[PDB]
Structures are given as C-alpha cells and as structure tokens.
Amino acid sequence: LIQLIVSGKDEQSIAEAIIVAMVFSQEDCMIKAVRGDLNFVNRANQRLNPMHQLLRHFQKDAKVLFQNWGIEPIDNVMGMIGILPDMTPSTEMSLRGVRVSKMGVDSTERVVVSIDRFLRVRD
C-alpha cells in the first residue's frame, strides 16, 4: 500500500475503510497478522476465497492488524490528519501510508468506450 486517504463520516466507518484497504493491499504484514482460528475451507472442504476470509476475520478483530501494520512520520499538510493503531487521530504519527481527510473526497459517472475484436475496451 503506497498511500491511502480516507474521508469516512464516522470513526467506525474509518476503521472499516482502512481494514478493507489493507486487505485489498495484500501486504505481507497483513497476512502475517492473521491469528486465531481462521479456516480457508468450509465444513464441506470447499476452497473459499482467501480475500473474503481475510476481510471477514479482520473485520471481526482488527487490533492485531493495526498493531503489526506499522507507523510512519506525518508530513504536516493542511486537511490531512494521521491515525494511530488505537484509532485515535494524531498529527505527528500515523499508520504506514494512511491519512484522514475532514473535507471530504469526491462522483459516479458512466463513460462511453470502444471495444475491439479481442474484447479490449479502450476509452
């Protein structure tokens, strides 16, 4: 994860968005953060989607992931506030590549596109 700027409405929402972003990153520090009883095969032994299992596990408990993700210094920038593993915002420290914006972030729009013979969609 190079950078992430969240603009959640609530602290709980901020935590949920960060967890989703960390899981989507697939960073090794998050895979190693998996702890306790997590199964990637159901009772029928079918193979579940690992991303969904990780997302569910980390949404159930994110304390370990936040603790092991890592911390970095914050470059003072107007409107950007860091966030710490204990969820309390900070101005000097923050999670690695994580920022919180209080002014909002911009929005859905459909764009016409051209598709060639080999199904390669281009703008």
Binding site: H52, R56, K60, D61
Partner: peptide
Amino acid sequence: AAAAAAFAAAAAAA
C-alpha cells in the same frame, strides 16, 4: 455527500 457502496458483504468492527 452521502453515497452508497454498491455490492457489500461485511459486518461491524470491535
């Protein structure tokens, strides 16, 4: 600027 999130399958953290 309240907005939806399309498909979703997640619960709340603790």
